[PDB]
Amino acid sequence: CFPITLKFVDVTGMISPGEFMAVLGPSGSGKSTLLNAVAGRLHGKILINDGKITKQTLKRTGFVAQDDLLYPHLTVRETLVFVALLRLPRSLTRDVKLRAAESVISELGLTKCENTVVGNTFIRGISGGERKRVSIAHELLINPSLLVLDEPTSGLDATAALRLVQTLAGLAHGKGKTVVTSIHQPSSRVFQMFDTVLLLSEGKCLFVGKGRDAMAYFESVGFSPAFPMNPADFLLDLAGITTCIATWFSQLCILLHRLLKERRHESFDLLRIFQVVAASILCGLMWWHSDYRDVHDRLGLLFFISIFWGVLPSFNAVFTFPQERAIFTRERASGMYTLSSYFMAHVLGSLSMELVLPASFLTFTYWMVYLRPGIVPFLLTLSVLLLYVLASQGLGLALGAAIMDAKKASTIVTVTMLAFVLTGGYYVNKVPSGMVWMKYVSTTFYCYRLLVAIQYGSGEEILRMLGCDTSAGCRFVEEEVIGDVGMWTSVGVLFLMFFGYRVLAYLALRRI
Amino acid sequence: CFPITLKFVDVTGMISPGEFMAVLGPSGSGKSTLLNAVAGRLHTGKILINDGKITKQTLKRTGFVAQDDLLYPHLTVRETLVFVALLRLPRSLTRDVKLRAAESVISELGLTKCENTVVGNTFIRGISGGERKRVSIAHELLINPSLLVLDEPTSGLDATAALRLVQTLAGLAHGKGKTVVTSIHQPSSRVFQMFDTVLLLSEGKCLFVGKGRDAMAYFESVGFSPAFPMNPADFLLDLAGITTCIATWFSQLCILLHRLLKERRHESFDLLRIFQVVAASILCGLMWWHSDYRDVHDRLGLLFFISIFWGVLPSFNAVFTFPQERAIFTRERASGMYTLSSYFMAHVLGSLSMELVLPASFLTFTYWMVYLRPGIVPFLLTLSVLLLYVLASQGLGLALGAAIMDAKKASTIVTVTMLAFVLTGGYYVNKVPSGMVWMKYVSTTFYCYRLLVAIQYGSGEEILRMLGCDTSAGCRFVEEEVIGDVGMWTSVGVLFLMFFGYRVLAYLALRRI
16 A cells, blocks of 8 residues: 655644544644545645645545435445445445445445445444444545544444454554544543544644643643643643546446435335325325216316426425435545436435326326327327426425525425416416416416316317206306317427426536 | 432442442343332332331332433423422422422532523433433422432433533532432543442343442452453443312412423424414405305305314324323322323313414404305304314324324324224215215214304305205206204214313323323
8 A cells, every 4th residue: 555644734743654643633723624624625735645735636535424325225235336336446346346336345344234224323234333333434435545434433332433444454554554533522532442543622733743642741841730630631631538438338337326225215105106006096086987968077186186296396306405415525536436326316316206106196097087088088088287397396495405404495396386286277276467477387277278178178079968058057068178278289298397396406406 | 319229139239328338230131120119119028218118108219310301391490390390299288398408409410500591302402412311300399209219310411511411410419418329331531430339230130239340359369350551340241188189179270370381382383284274364355255145055164174174183183192191190190290180171271271362363364355244143153153162173183193193194094094984974975875974973073063153154045045955956956065964062062072072082092001
């Protein structure tokens, strides 16, 4: 392993190969600022191998941040191979990347829990120590030389912290690496395993040198312990185009494969299937063997279907982008994936996974309500319903990507969907003169018109079977069963919205 | 301030007045079980208090400060402590004496600095962890405890805060003659020196009993000695009448209502809720701007939308209250603060008072822009009907929230129930199948919609004759929407019956758990 020599002036100290430096300071002293500046994230002189900070030096330095951002439903080995496939250079073969991932698994003691779901506070899985080990293994794949972590033992027990310090010191005394860490409140064994200790107070450095020399230095200065105690406690108290296409498509494929489990968890929730089944049963019971002559009942059923399947997916889509932002930023900063690949992977996964439920709903409902028999009408209404669902999910994604607050986005989406629903043409027919323009921007309007045109058409049939060829009543029936827009205009506008909402969501993401 | 002497056999040890005993052990050893059993909450061996069996008279003197801190966010420190004093102090004393006891408790715990400061939580800003723990300790200091058995007081706190808390806890034992017993997760160096008696637990077995200072010499004499400068506790862990009853009930209800006012205000007067209500009102006033009575179908749609909105909102919003306060309810009912009846009625009255402002403003804005029936009697009648419907729906929400104690499952069940109620409201489908006609009578939206239609149109003769129906099938379509299947008084009676019955069922469901 190439040796890395570290120098910083204005705080000052040396970090050399084989030295396990630890930054010690009171909570709030400012250890995090120096720890981040040593890595190079921040933007006196800091010199690495007697040279200025350059991108050639940064490819061999890691940073295991305190925040552990891991995907829950992925096993340890699946996670690490996905990381390896996306982080290692593309010139190498797949088998070599897999072997590197396995070597990383083997050398960190994660063999015991290789086939175990990572999980989180919600889904049961690995413990905190294994989570931290996986976090370290994330950046151990690129073979770093300057490994600067940040609070690795925070939130862990004494035994787990001791074992983690054991592994971290072994990675520096057996591989020639410059492991630099910072510890909140060191224990006895944790402190005795130190090699170099840096004390920080109000940003000013109190002591630099070996940890063992700290006690002798301080007792020589004039300050000595008065009772049996931990020395660290005393210290704290004192203180080409083809290649580009191949890369893009490989990134998209890997991201889709990785996000499949999250997509499955998002859509196939037991508290969503229950609602869908209850809605289907109620729809099939309230309209059991409906008659085509009862126009108003069928129109109400169609409007209810439109309301339900415009409200559900649009509201369900506002949580995805704000919830994965930390992961997106952290892995993009490392060069794992770009915005385009991640966005398209999310779009394709959502499109694939958010269509099964409405299909089952319509399949159950169509043949019990006694709608128009045949194959062409059923296929046409299924296609219209799926297109409407996709457009509504597009609006949901756009509003979730515009502002990054989940509850504010939910409130705005509810207001927008209420405005759309109150202009679908079912509740109000005498729309005010200055208020007639918003029906053209409503997805529910186009979906309802398409469903009505599919089920009844121009309306001549039920017009003549009902009796007409009151006058006001038949005018009301006609204006219910005639279209203010054509059959193709609705489909065109639906497709245009489906594309435009995603385009706007991508632009809004690009700003942040 | 008076001596309590403690002996326990089968683990064995003694804790005497003026002794600051602390239980030390690795995480998972079982210190919590012994600490809880010493207090008396557990129910072989004997735990003898003052050379006697555990009795409620002795149970008064002892006090437990649990690790979990359950505090009301919006209340200030002094407001909280005076409410506690008025609740759990004896009713024979005057109000001024209780307030003075609360003030003295504030003064003696160093909480004077943050007396007029909101307690808050992770969401609302306020006091820090040390002050939260100090308030939690002050909760049980009002009854003048003589055996204070806490549970991990310094967990989750900084070194300086933990040292100061240990300072205060030791001062309360060496200046007032109290038997303070705690347990510390991982003691520091300065903290351990203040220990007076240390008990070491390993797999439930007592490794060492006696003075903390004697631990090092004893363990060196046994054969185990430190090999490097290290903290001693680290080595130890590594080795390891009817009138009076009525007065009491009504006073408890009054105090609870006064205390819960701020939480009720926070629950209802949320800016997002106001924004939703304002947007709904504006949309309703814009879609039906200067509506005409002759357009019956549009007005019926408006009434049904109002019914849907104000049946869906409060019923779903009222489903979170009971599950979120269960820990507080159980903890303060165990101490004897309030009974189930007083707490339930206080919550009911607070919700009734605070859940009527928004619909009143909504209807007041909407009525005079949609151009509904003019006058005063119709407006007052429709306002009363809307308020009654809102209360009934909130009753269903409360009942379902109190039946099963899970917020999201309750929300799903409430949404399913409200969808079933809405689908059978009489607006979407008129040809109801024969086997599903009974479900219309159990719907609150049905009765509310019928009442609104009867208020606005009545028997419907007027618009029938102005519309010209003074085909027959076409008139039947108009007639079937205005002519109701129930009377005007049956709907009101059933609404009142549901308003009472849902709350009764909620109380029964609460009584079970």
